[model samples]
Target: MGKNVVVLGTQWGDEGKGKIVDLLTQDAQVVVRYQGGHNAGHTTVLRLIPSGMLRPNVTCYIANGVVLSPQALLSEIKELEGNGINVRERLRISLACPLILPYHIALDKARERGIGPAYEDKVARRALRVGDLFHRDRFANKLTELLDYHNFVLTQYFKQPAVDLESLLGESLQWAEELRPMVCDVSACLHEHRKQGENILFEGAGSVINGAGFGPRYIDYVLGITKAYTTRVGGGPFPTELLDDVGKRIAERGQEFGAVTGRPRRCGWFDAVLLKRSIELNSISGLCVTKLDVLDGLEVLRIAVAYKDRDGNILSRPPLAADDFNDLLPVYEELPGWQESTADVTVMSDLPANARAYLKRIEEILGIPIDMLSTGPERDSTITLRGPFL
Candidate 1:
């Protein structure tokens, strides 16, 4: 049987998953992105192309679960082509993907300004799928109706400029023409790959907290990509966030900025409390820890083993409500930091004694094996403790 593996972030986001995915694609014949949209920026090999594209033999898919932005994808294709990558031959996009229209971008931004309609129009039965764009008459009618509603809301409710229907339609039609060759039935393609006994890798957006809907029962291995220290983009309750110089140091060393948004991330100590929740939620079998060298010179390192709620109750798992989550205070356990550089260390025994202990402690706390260790960003700068291939 071929392995159906899932590689996802365990932290808030930006856990060097792209690099790790690129590295692992050496074995994966098919790589599928199962969820999220262009908003979830992934930094793969050569900094932009989807990780699997780096391997010329591997096929890549933007599955039905993704909310795809045709314009963004087209732009990516152009850039990858410019870099000598044969994207058209290898890339397949699910026709079932809900198209991210100009209005969606307007609404997304307008929501940041406090007023916007439902984020997903598909659930409301008003989405434009990739397949719909190919039918000229049907597309034109739906576009007209959708534009009218979005324009009205933008101008009347949000006091924003109306989306230019003529321009948007022209651009969208052009995007449809350019992307039509790549549209495919992603699930069918994956099934075909599986029948051939090929390794299929499912790459998820954001963290386990965001929850991609792929069933765990079908996955052969779930690889949770984690950073040595935690980092989150945008807003969320961070129990171990360090507002001090140490936090800034971690951020700076790790290059902790959102690849897509370019926003600085909030850095913190590793929280096993959060990882435990992630492991259970995603059914993560192993972890690939990255940025271990970023902690090189620190005199002491801390990991959040548990959380204390406002009423002094200890929490092994996160509360359901955001308000309750915000009230969490981290209970940390300090450990010795290593001065020796661990970057490019491929052997477990070659790792500094203190560094080994740190990893050992994390494994002990999480009760999961560390299958891979990423010492740096380079494709070869990784140590594989156990292979995911069955």
Candidate 2:
């Protein structure tokens, strides 16, 4: 029987899932990206396309659930092609994938400025899609009409500059022509591949804590990639956030910057409370603890056991409201730090006793095993206690 493994970020994304996916892709016959847009800065597959492309037999899919960006995908394609990796043949995109146009990006920025709607207009069902691009005249005509409303919203409602529709159409049409060959019914293709008993690996976006699913079959295993310390891109309430020098050190050491947005992520100590919540949400079978080397030589280490409210009430679980999280403080458990470097240490037994203890403690707390450990950035730097293929 072929296995279907899902690799997801357990914390607030950027947990080095891309690398884990790349590692797993070595054995997987198919790799499917299910959700999120270009907003996801996946380093392994997105940044390192050459890694996947090098394996000519492996098929890659951008499924229907994802919010596709023509410009972003084109930019990545250009980069990979420039690097001599032929992505055109092996990759397939879902026709049902919603297109994130120039207006969507404009709207996204405007929303940040507190101008228009704070989220994508997908709920209204007026969004363009990958299939729409194939019909040039129709797509252009539709875009013009959509722009009329979007322009009014920007100029009159938000007082922002109107997007140039003609310019967007020209560049978008060019991108459509380039991307046309890759478009297909991804779900059907996956189903067809499943009939052949091919090993499939699903790559999820954003955080595993947020509920999302793939139909047609049960996910054989869920591998949550979590950083040894916590780091979040964009604005959010982080109970264990360390705004101190240690945080800065962790950020700089780990290169904790958004792969897509280029924003510096807020760094902190590990949040077991957050991981516990993610465990319950994703039903994660195992975890791959990444960036353990970034903690090297620290005098001490801290993990958030729980959070406390304004009245000192312990919060063992996360509150539903974002505002409630803002008023919370972390209850930390400190651990001894090791002077020995874990960088490129492929053997789990060779890891420092303190490091082993730290990993063991997290396992004990979450009631899940740490099957893989990433000591560094490269593919060879991982210590695999067990892998999905096994």
> How would you encode candidate 2's per-residue C-alpha lDDT over 264-328 as one tens digit per residue?
88999999989888988878899999999999999999989989998889988888899887668
lDDT of 2: 0.79
Q: Which prediction has the highest lDDT against the true structure?
A: 1
How much does candidate 2 score in TM-score?
0.87
Looking at model 2, residue 267 earns an lDDT score of 93
- Alpha carbon lDDT of each predicted model: 0.81, 0.79
Please report how far candidate 2 places residue 91 from its true position, in Å.
1.2
lDDT of 1 by residue, 31-50 (tens): 88776665445443232234
TM-score of each model, paired residue for residue: 0.91, 0.87
Off by over 4 Å in 2: 40-51, 113-119, 206-213, 233-236, 243-245, 257-265
Which ranges in model 1 have alpha carbons more than 4 Å from their true place? 40-49, 113-119, 206-215, 257-264, 325-327
Clashing pairs in 2: none
